[PDB]
Design a protein around this ligand. Structure first.
Ligand code: CA
Lengths: 4, 368
């Protein structure tokens, strides 16, 4: 997996 | 203080880095998923709007020559946030910005693993940003953790710093990504690696003149789908505690995270050019690139000779509280659950944020  | 968005060029003032050199003498990497074509146009908009010299960039296809490095449209927001926040935090200059692009057509998590591997094998970027992650137990189950930890171990040995966002789900990383789950707490990979610097998130308040005022824990509660938006923090269930963390007494024999934290609240976030339009963006995806840009200045001040800094951060900050802004208020859960900030190291925010000029003076006197 996920973009934070 | 006030909660507002910030141009990334304000982060040096906020974190006391204006008197440091820029990162003009340090090469910095960014790990991406897929391509960065729009991101490079947005970066041009950024440096041109701010009246800065252009940034030297390179894009690296890290897997198969026949892989898919097309732009991920949502992804461009992340690579925009990362690149503009790095360059702003660095004082407006980096030697080169290297985009290590993961192949999107590769099996499993192998595209991402090969992006990390290439950055380590090339060994040209001193500092590498990783504004991404997922449930560490998932990474563990399919062997991705073990494979990637080997790569980060090599990085640390060769004096490279990977900076990794701690997560945006508070304590609920493994629960459908962020759905409240009572007292069941978890952490993100690769932040839980002892071989990277894990970077958590704050709510940043500034004075009317734009100076630092204070920071609390990043916790913006639940969105309309019921998912929590807060700083990741806790301990790994798999990774053992590296010895330098023994200064945090009364914690389990596991890698505690994050190490340090910077601005992450959307409400106090960065103003980022994304497909040509300015957006106010937060997350620990912001906090990590702020660290990367600031740390790159300290590298440039020290002839790129500073090695993997985890042990030094823990020894220096535990003995020298003036090097940080210690976050004391807030929690990274919901409904009375989660961890609380407090004096010194805590699970939401680690040591808090760095005061860069003070850290620089410390390094001049003592090394790092
Ligand atoms: Ca604290």
């Amino acid at each position: 997996x996920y973009l934070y | 203080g006030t909660a507002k968005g910030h141009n990334p060029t304000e982060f040096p003032t906020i974190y006391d880095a204006s008197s440091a050199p820029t990162a003009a003498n340090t090469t910095v990497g960014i790990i991406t998923i897929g391509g960065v074509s729009q991101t490079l146009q947005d970066l041009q908009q950024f440096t041109s709007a701010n009246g800065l010299a252009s940034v030297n960039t390179q894009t690296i296809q890290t897997g198969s020559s026949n892989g898919d490095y097309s732009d991920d449209q949502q992804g461009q927001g992340e690579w925009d946030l990362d690149s503009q926040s790095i360059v702003g935090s660095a004082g407006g200059a980096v030697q080169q910005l290297l985009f290590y692009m993961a192949d999107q057509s590769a099996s499993g998590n192998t595209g991402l693993t090969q992006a990390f591997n290439q950055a380590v094998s090339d060994n040209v970027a001193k500092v590498i940003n990783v504004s991404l992650g997922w449930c560490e137990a998932d990474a563990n189950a399919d062997g991705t953790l073990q494979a990637e930890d080997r790569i980060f171990a090599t990085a640390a040995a060769q004096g490279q710093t990977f900076s990794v966002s701690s997560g945006d789900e508070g304590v609920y990383e493994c629960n459908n990504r962020g759905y409240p789950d009572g007292s069941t707490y978890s952490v993100s990979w690769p932040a839980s690696s002892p071989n990277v610097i894990a970077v958590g998130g704050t709510t940043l308040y500034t004075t009317s003149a734009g100076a630092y005022s204070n920071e609390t824990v990043w916790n913006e509660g639940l969105d309309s789908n019921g998912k929590l938006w807060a700083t990741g923090g806790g301990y790994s269930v798999y990774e053992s505690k590296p010895s330098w963390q023994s200064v945090v007494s009364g914690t389990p024999g596991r890698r505690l995270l994050p190490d340090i934290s910077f601005d992450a609240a959307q409400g106090t976030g960065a103003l980022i050019y994304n497909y040509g339009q300015l957006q106010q963006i937060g997350g620990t995806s912001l906090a990590s690139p702020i660290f990367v840009g600031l740390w790159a200045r300290l590298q440039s001040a020290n002839s790129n000779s500073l090695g993997f800094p985890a042990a030094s951060f823990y020894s220096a900050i535990s003995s020298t509280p003036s090097l940080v802004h210690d976050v004391k208020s807030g929690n990274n859960g919901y409904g009375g659950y989660g961890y609380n900030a407090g004096t010194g190291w805590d699970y939401p925010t680690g040591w808090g944020s760095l005061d860069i000029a003070k850290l620089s003076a410390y390094i001049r006197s003592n090394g790092f």
